[PDB]
């Protein structure tokens, strides 16, 4: 997260870190046994870390659970990033408390202009590399589809939404993928891609979660 602020400790209880030796992606807890992330974050072996704040220090509130099943959307396209969504079933149910909680799936698609919260442990610089120990937060609005398409000519599908600022300066970055975009208490987006980080006229692009609620629910029920 570039241009954000350190989140209040445990103020984003649904945020998780995907780890396979080191932190490589984020995710969101949607129920006691399932996590949603980005399909490009796929790894054959993944450990999910919940209740995290400082990703490099054992704090005592964390829960470490291995992924039992990893299911990418069947229509995921590695080149266009269309349908960049993935579900992870945990080996065992996690303990829900004040530090570890679920986030609700969208009741409908949020309209442009809706203020949201993006979070993650990704790079904090537009130029160079600075990986934060503490979870970073960013308040940003859903942008009109027209501006998204104008920023990325012919690259935006109906399953994507831009969130951020056309002037740049604030954006998600490498290490944030799979992370949550929550608006009014509902998961509306998943950090996916973008050209660079926080660059003018190139806001971050996110997977539009409201188009996948049925796929998510049906998949969870069948596995």
């Amino acid at each position: 997260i570039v241009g954000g602020y350190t989140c209040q400790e445990n103020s984003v209880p649904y945020q998780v870190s995907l780890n396979s030796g080191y932190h490589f992606c984020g995710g969101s807890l949607i129920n006691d046994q399932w996590v949603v992330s980005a399909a490009h974050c796929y790894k054959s072996r993944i450990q999910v870390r919940l209740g995290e704040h400082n990703i490099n220090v054992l704090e005592g509130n964390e829960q470490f659970v291995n992924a039992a099943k990893i299911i990418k959307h069947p229509n995921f396209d590695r080149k266009t990033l269309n349908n960049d969504i993935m579900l992870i079933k945990l080996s065992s149910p996690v303990k829900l408390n004040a530090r570890v909680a679920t986030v609700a799936l969208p009741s409908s698609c949020a309209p442009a202009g809706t203020q949201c919260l993006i979070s993650g442990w990704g790079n904090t610089l537009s130029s160079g590399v600075n990986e934060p120990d503490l979870l970073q937060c960013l308040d940003a609005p859903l942008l009109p589809q027209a501006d998204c398409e104008a920023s990325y000519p012919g690259k935006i599908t109906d399953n994507m939404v831009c969130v951020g600022f056309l002037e740049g300066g604030k954006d998600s970055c490498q290490g944030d993928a799979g992370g949550p975009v929550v608006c009014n208490g509902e998961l509306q987006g998943i950090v996916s891609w973008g050209y660079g980080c926080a660059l003018p006229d190139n806001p971050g692009v996110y997977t539009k979660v409201c188009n996948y609620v049925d796929w998510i629910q049906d998949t969870i029920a069948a596995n």
Binding site: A38, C41, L81, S192
Partner: protein, 56 residues
Amino acid sequence: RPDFALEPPYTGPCKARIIRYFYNAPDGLAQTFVYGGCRAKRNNFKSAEDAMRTAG
């Protein structure tokens, strides 16, 4: 050596944080960089020895 061996590391548009190896032509050595997770270029390897074997 191949042309792709002289190109700088390509992070790409995706936002994952994946450590990969690349051949640093000038310094003449294999080093690491942050790969985004998609649309990788040829100067991108999962191991140092694999990079040296190809770009050595």
